[PDB]
């Protein structure tokens, strides 16, 4: 709600560069986006160069829509940067789709850290150019970006059964379990113990020292073994975004500031849509409307979303989470000679009852192009 005033102020505070070329050129191959994007971007000693309008061209393709090609790049690179295959990132657990910095990333790749900085730069780029990365990260990540403490609570959303194991210890006598100040870890088939403090293998966990046990296990689960990587990331990110400017957002907002989906799911959109003045899900005009939305590309879909809601922010989770609280609505207004109009105030599209699918497609597309002016 205040995010609108915040994001406005944020962008207003984001200074334009006056000493830098008109476009940032990128000449990439889809087959090797990571390599190609990495070399180019980590070549640039001045971060400011990356604030130029992104001019990206894949596999020789000439003269495509600049802001639409960016959209693709941010998606494809995000797909590659965050692929756990590489061991920079990894899934929070098995049967989890969220992501976290892999502590053993340096074992995987010796130059992990410059790749982390790179990802930070690419993430800060996304922000700077009002675009988004395609990533489900754990709240801890966003906390660590604000230098905010990690807690036992934070483990629940990540791993409930493991959180419960620690919660149990908080509320019950651990003497039963003959534990030590060690955590065992498996990496590349081998297993390893890790002492949580000096000589932790010799230290029994008891009622007198369990609150210390819990604390230390959290730092080890989330903070201690990813400082170098997260630092690198933060360095790259803040090369493009001032840290003072990021300070006004919290951990929830900061996921909405930089993460989100690069296409609006249509089933989700259709699921959370209301109709007024004769229209209805199985009405002919509504059938044609969704046919259009379905047969758009992501770029046309996002331009439509902006036309009607006034934003391009795809949250993840739901269209239910769309704030009073107002969901998407489609009302009958006017005649076929009138183009359709929107009310970002009410998240409402006023759609005349058209003769055909193609009429609706054209009249709507023009109305959107009329707001591009």
């Amino acid at each position: 709600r205040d995010y609108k005033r915040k994001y406005e102020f944020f962008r207003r505070k984001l200074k334009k560069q006056n000493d830098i070329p008109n476009k940032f050129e990128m000449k990439l191959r889809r087959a090797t986006v990571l390599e190609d994007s990495y070399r180019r971007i980590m070549g640039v000693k001045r971060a400011d160069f990356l604030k130029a309008r992104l001019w990206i061209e894949f596999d020789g393709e000439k003269g495509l829509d600049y802001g639409g090609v960016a959209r693709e790049w941010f998606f494809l690179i995000s797909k590659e940067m965050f692929n756990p295959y590489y061991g920079l990132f990894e899934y929070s657990a098995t049967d989890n789709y969220t992501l976290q910095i892999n502590p053993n990333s340096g074992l995987c790749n010796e130059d992990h850290l410059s790749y982390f900085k790179f990802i930070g730069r690419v993430a800060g780029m996304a922000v700077y150019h009002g675009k988004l990365l395609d990533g489900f990260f754990i709240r801890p990540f966003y906390k660590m970006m604000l230098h905010k403490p990690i807690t036992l609570h934070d483990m629940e959303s990540v791993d409930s059964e493991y959180y419960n194991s620690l919660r149990w210890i908080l509320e019950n006598d651990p003497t039963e379990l003959d534990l030590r100040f060690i955590i065992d870890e498996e990496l590349f088939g081998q297993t390893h113990q890790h002492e949580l403090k000096n000589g932790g293998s010799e230290i029994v966990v008891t009622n007198k020292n369990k609150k210390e046990y819990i604390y230390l296990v959290i730092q080890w689960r989330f903070v201690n073994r990813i400082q170098k990587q997260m630092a690198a990331f933060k360095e790259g990110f803040f090369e493009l975004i001032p840290q003072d400017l990021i300070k006004i957002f919290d951990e929830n907002e900061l996921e909405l500031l930089m993460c989100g989906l690069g296409d609006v799911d249509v089933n989700d959109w259709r699921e959370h849509t209301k109709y007024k003045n004769g229209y209805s899900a199985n009405h002919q005009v509504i059938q044609w409307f969704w046919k259009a939305v379905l047969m758009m590309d992501s770029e046309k879909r996002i331009r439509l979303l902006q036309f009607v809601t006034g934003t391009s922010r795809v949250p993840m989770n739901g269209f239910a989470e769309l704030y009073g609280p107002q969901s998407f609505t489609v009302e009958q207004w006017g005649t076929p000679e009138k183009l359709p109009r929107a009310h970002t105030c009410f998240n409402r599209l006023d759609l005349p009852p058209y003769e055909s699918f193609e009429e609706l497609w054209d009249k709507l597309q023009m109305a959107i192009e009329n707001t591009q002016g």
């Binding site: 692929n83 756990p84 295959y85 590489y86 061991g87 790749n109 088939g189 081998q190």
Partner: protein
């Protein structure tokens, strides 16, 4: 993919290799093989270039000159695949 499977049916004629992603392919080979050509076997099954791989058995990063027997790998020896950078 489909091709890898179909080609095997006509061969005149089991180990596992896991990734940090969750999935892990299973290859068929004889321990005479080096590291270099096994990367190709992965090129075939999943479409990953031989350059773009690191192979690790017993938590030790594997060498091109040596063979599978030289790195004491056996039937159902779990291997580990992580991308090069």
């Amino acid at each position: 993919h489909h091709h890898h499977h179909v080609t095997s049916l006509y061969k005149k004629a089991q180990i596992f290799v896991k990734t940090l992603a969750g999935w892990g392919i299973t290859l068929e080979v004889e321990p005479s093989d080096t590291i270099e050509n096994v990367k190709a076997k992965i090129q075939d099954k999943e479409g990953i270039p031989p350059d773009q791989q690191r192979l690790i058995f017993a938590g030790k990063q594997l060498e091109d000159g040596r063979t599978l027997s030289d790195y004491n790998i056996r039937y159902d020896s779990q291997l580990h695949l992580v991308g090069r950078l």
